[PDB]
Design a protein around this ligand. Sequence first.
Ligand code: HEM
Ligand SMILES: O[C@@](Cc1ccccc1Cl)(Cn1cncn1)C1(Cl)CC1
Length: 529
Amino acid sequence: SIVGEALEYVNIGLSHFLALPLAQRISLIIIIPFIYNIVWQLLYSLRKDRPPLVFYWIPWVGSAVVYGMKPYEFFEECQKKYGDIFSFVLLGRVMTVYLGPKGHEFVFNAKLADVSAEAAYAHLTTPVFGKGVIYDCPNSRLMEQKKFVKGALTKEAFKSYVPLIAEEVYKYFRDSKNFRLNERTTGTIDVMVTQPEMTIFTASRSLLGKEMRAKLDTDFAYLYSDLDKGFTPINFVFPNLPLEHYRKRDHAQKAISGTYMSLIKERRKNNDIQDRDLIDSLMKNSTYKDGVKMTDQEIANLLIGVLMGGQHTSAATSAWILLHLAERPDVQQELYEEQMRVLDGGKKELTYDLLQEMPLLNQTIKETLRMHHPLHSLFRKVMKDMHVPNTSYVIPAGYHVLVSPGYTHLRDEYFPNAHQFNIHRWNNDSASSYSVGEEVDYGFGAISKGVSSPYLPFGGGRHRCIGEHFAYCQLGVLMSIFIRTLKWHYPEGKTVPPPDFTSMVTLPTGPAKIIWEKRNPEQKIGGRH
Ligand code: HEM
Ligand SMILES: O[C@@](Cc1ccccc1Cl)(Cn1cncn1)C1(Cl)CC1
């Protein structure tokens, strides 16, 4: 009765292992984790308290490639095989996806102690925006920062922003090489060139003020480009590897936040604090409820985060609006008639109030956001084991949950003929979003308590967007002027481009070109240039 002999051979086998030729160790270096990964999944599949896990060949990497390149096609296939709740491995992480409205509820309305946004996102945003704000701070601090920013995003502020945004659009039509409407009556543009520029010019002028706008006419503008490059999914995996891309980013954040702090300190020095912009607003209103004041640095960092977030979602969206309308001269025509009726043939100056009397224009924004949600996936890190209602599934702490309202936007069950661009599906329902019942306030205003709406472009719950009305104002003004000034169409045999899902938002694959022409060839834009 000797297992002793077998124990000796374990030890012997171990020493013979360590003495294998390098070619075989390297081999086993790869064979043993590859094999282990596969038997681990098979064992995992037997667990009744876990959602089904998408099978993958490469350890650590997981389904990263197919998810990264075609997330909605990935979800649809998984949904057919497994149903609405399933997990997949992503660059060392386990992601649990809950599709559909119940998914929205599970994640967006999750208890504060159950999940963490900042633990999922801080590595992406903190290097770009700076310390102490958004996700580099406790949730309670984020809630109040959202309250401070929302305090400058009032109806009165929008009434004052509309003519400023309009001035910037007209200036861009007058001065930009992409247009020059006083010199040229037709031309070709890449919308992924023009919309980022139009977006930063309009958002700078209105949210940051004339000083910060004026700086964009200089070499300073290049820092925004640099800071922009740092805003990339690569930050999720390699947040800080010592390359030049990362240094240009870090430098830009310092230079840009330094510029904002210079203005802030100048205004306080001169008692020059009015109600012009978001800077005036945060200077007057940025004291937390425990009495700590945001620092000038944190105020500047919060300005960067707000401008940068709004930059990418808005620019992507007006690009998509232009691209869907380029093959729909019927929609351009209908929008143009609305412009003529609401603005008395163009005799009335556009105001924020008249924007609210443009339902087809607003429905066009609404429908573009349905077909092209800028953020295909939203994430939380699971902090406490979560039971999935009406199942035996438990999502353990350390997992991440993923929700995708943009996926549901594209399902025929909730939006008939979902892959058809049709602004009239929103007839008599042109509001950017609408709360169908009870409300709750997490610290930045009363918002919808339920988050089961199949249309959820602005998310929901404590992390819900506060930029929605600014975006509609900005997009509204911009598109109102595009429509009254130009017609546009595709180059021969071109059509709406497929989305690029790998960038930070779901951009059109470029170059995405349209041909514009002036509705009034002789019309001139005044002002000095
Ligand atoms: C078409 C335009 C936009 C869309 C579709 C959009 C979408 C969203 C979504 C889905 C969220 C929820 C994020 C999550 O749950 O993880 C969000 C949050 C947020 N957005 Fe927007 N957004 C847009 C424009 C803007 C603009 C213009 C601003 C600022 C001016 C802005 C600022 C914010 C802020 C501060 C949050 C809160 C993040 C948090 O609490 O964790 N967004 N947005
Ligand atoms: O939600 C964000 C972050 C985010 C979340 C999910 C996917 C991509 C990004 Cl960039 C993106 N965004 C949402 N609205 C405006 N920007 C921030 Cl920057 C916090 C607000």
